[PDB]
């Protein structure tokens, strides 16, 4: 039972470690795309809206 509790505690802390890693890495990778918009060029749009 002691060994099982140790495994549970390791499982608990490593869940938060893994969640932070997954969320932060995915967010960074996709925020790289969120800031890759077409540059605001000094031109009119190709197709008049």
């Amino acid at each position: 039972s002691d060994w099982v509790r140790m495994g549970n505690a390791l499982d608990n802390i490593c869940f938060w470690a893994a969640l932070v890693l997954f969320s932060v890495g995915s967010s960074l990778i996709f925020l790289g795309a969120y800031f890759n918009r077409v540059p605001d060029l000094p031109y009119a749009p190709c197709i008049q809206p």
Binding site: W3, R5, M6, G7, A9, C14, I29, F30, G32
Partner: protein, 50 residues
Amino acid sequence: TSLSVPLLGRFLIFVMVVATLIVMNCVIVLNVSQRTPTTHAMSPRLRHVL
């Protein structure tokens, strides 16, 4: 091409690395959980830590 790595590939390799690390972690947690006194001795330092 190989001038850079696309975002899709980067994300897939990242999640594959994360899944590999989580597999290693699950193996470690299983190894710790299933220790029996007939094979392993009760390490008191790690017990105090955890």
